[PDB]
Amino acid sequence: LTACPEESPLLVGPMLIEFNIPVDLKLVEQQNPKVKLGGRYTPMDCISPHKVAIIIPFRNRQEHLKYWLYYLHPILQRQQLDYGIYVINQAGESMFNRAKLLNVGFKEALKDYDYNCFVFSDVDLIPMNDHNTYRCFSQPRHISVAMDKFGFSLPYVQYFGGVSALSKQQFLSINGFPNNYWGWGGEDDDIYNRLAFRGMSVSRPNAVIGKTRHIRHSRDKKNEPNPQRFDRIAHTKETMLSDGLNSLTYMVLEVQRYPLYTKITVDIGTPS
């Protein structure tokens, strides 16, 4: 074989993305016969330099996930990526912790395969153009840059929520993500602070190819706005070495290897 071309000959460009169509995981599996157990795929005729673990924070979002899988699997294959899908399921009924779930996905995926790239994607984001490559770059990559719920633009230049990608070294560089953000908000801003403090710039595709759709939804119970988030963002420079990968504690309760993804149910503790 040889290295995969910088531009895949499979890309179609702009895509029609909607969430009313009846989707079936059996059908999705049937439509993607090259997707191996656990949501793993590898280009047959070229060597992908990108070994990407796609981490999805999850609790009670099976319907959103079904649409995510339905759209992403064809897209990711056309992008000629050596990838695997990881759905990190938070057990219990405590406050939701998006960032801690992402940390779990990082460590757990590394236990399966020597990934060198990590895409962190919300379960409800779908790219509208397959040129928006779900891989890592020389700088930390922000992927969901032109979401429809933000009028197809950035709400602010520091916005790092939604979908993003850090290489293994980039991720380790900032001691990963915080674990102390319980509830909604601020954890993405905190992560942006970490990248800045370690001297990294954010890489983004243009607003045209970075158009993504957000599945409109109501707030999940136990994901209410965190009142402490403002203070924590203020002190990111102090806490990023005391809160992250080096302080991550969790308990894997269950692992399930579905055809289209690996589901890891974890106990990540409670707020304090």
Binding-site positions: 57-61, 96-98, 123-124, 184, 186-189, 217-219, 229
**Whole-number CA gyration radius for the chain:** 18
**Span 187-206, contacts to ligand NGS by CB under 6 A:** 188-189
Q: Which residues pair with 87 in a beta bridge?
A: 56, 263
Q: Rounded CA gap, 121 and 140, in Å? A: 14
- CB 149, min distance to ligand NGS, A: 7
**Span 204-243, contacts to ligand UDH by CB under 6 A:** 218-220, 223
Helix axis angle, 98-110 to 187-197, nearest 10°: 60
**Phi, psi (5° rounding) for residue 31?**
-75, -20
From residue 139, give the alpha-carbon distance in Å to each of 110, 142, 162, 246.
Answer: 21, 9, 17, 22
Residue 189 binds which entry of ligand UDH, ligand NGS, Mn ion, none, CB below 5-8 Å type-dependent: ligand NGS
Considering only 82-90, 170-178, 182-190, 234-242, which stretch makes contact with ligand NGS by CB under 6 A?
Answer: 182-190
140 contributes a contact to ligand NGS by CB under 6 A: no
**Where do we find the tokens 């700088």?**
139
**Span 51-90, contacts to ligand UDH by CB under 6 A:** 57-61
Find the largest Cα–Cα distance for the chain. Answer: 53
Q: Strand 125-127 relative to strand 211-214: parallel, antiparallel, unpaired?
A: antiparallel
List the Cα angle 164/81/196 in 5-degree steps.
25
186 contributes a contact to ligand NGS by CB under 6 A: yes
Tell me which of 124, 187, 190, 243 binds Mn ion, using CB under 5 A.
124
**Span 14-53, contacts to ligand UDH by CB under 6 A:** none
Q: Summarize as ranges the residues that interact with ligand NGS (CB under 6 A).
A: 155, 161, 185-186, 188-189, 229-230, 233
Q: Summarize as ranges the residues that interact with ligand UDH (CB under 6 A).
A: 57-61, 96, 98, 122-124, 184, 218-220, 223
